[PDB]
Every structure is written in C-alpha cells, then in structure tokens.
C-alpha cells in the first residue's frame, strides 16, 4: 500500500496510547544509551502531535543540545536557546555526535513515515553521527514502502530501551 494510507494508520494507533506517558518512558529508555556512549552534541526536535516530547532528557542527561530549523529545503542547527525565530548562531551539522529523529512510524530497518517535505532525508546525509529513531512499540511498522531518497536511521528507541537497526 500507500504512504497515505499507512499514516492513517499510525494516527489511529497513536491515539489509543498516553503521549505524556510514553514520552517519559522512550526518554528514560534512552539513557543507559546515552550514558554508555558518552555523547556530547545531541540534535533534538520541538515536538510536534504525534510526537513524542522528549525536551526533559536534556535535564536527565547534561549535554550541549540542539534544534533544527528549517531554512530553504535544509535544516540548520542551532543551539537550544532563545527565540524571537532561533536567536543563536547557525552551526555546521559535523558538530553533532547524535540525531534524535521523530516520526510517524518506522520499521525494524531504519526507515521512517515522516512529514512528507523530505528535511531528514536531506539532513542525514549532512551528517557523521549516531542516529536513532524515537517510536512507541505500536508505530513500529512492518517494512514501509520504500523509495530512493529514502535515508534509514541507525538505532531505534522504544519504551523497551535501545537497539540496532540491523546493517543493510
């Protein structure tokens, strides 16, 4: 099928689940991660619905965060900080060490249901870093559909905690 129609799909499963609930358990999840990795520079996301909220990690796990913006059909990176519009400096992507990626859904294999406007995908091959995707167990997905532009994640994070996507 479409990738329509399985985003009706994924709405229907996040609604019958607890955002708040889910989001502190995916964040607490994350953490023996985070800590045995020691990561330093960690791009997040301003939560959107269907999303996941997971701002209180930076207080869980001290680093230097921040946020994408959109600028043309790029993201830039800007540390978390004062808005109006990010006030601080744009910086280079190769700062990074960790990409937390929101989505709709996503399979066992990296790929994920997004917004649909192809920002990740241009946005993960800017980057040398960790990547991990952030689902409920319920919007993990039998493999999407999948089309050339397409750009997997690297590890996935649960409420049951971390793994490896699997190497293609």
Known sequence: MTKAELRRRARAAWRR????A????VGAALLPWLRERGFRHILLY???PHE???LPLMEAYPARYYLPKVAGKGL???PFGPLAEPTTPPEDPRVLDLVVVPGLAFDREGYRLGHGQGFYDRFLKEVRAATVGVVPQAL????LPRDPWDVPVDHLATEAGVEAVKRP
């Open 17 to 20: 689940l607890d955002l708040k």
């Open 22 to 25: 889910l989001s502190r358990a």
């Open 52 to 54: 996941l909220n997971l």
């Open 76 to 78: 830039t990176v800007h």
């Open 46 to 48: 301003h939560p959107l």
């Open 140 to 143: 993990l997905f039998p493999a």
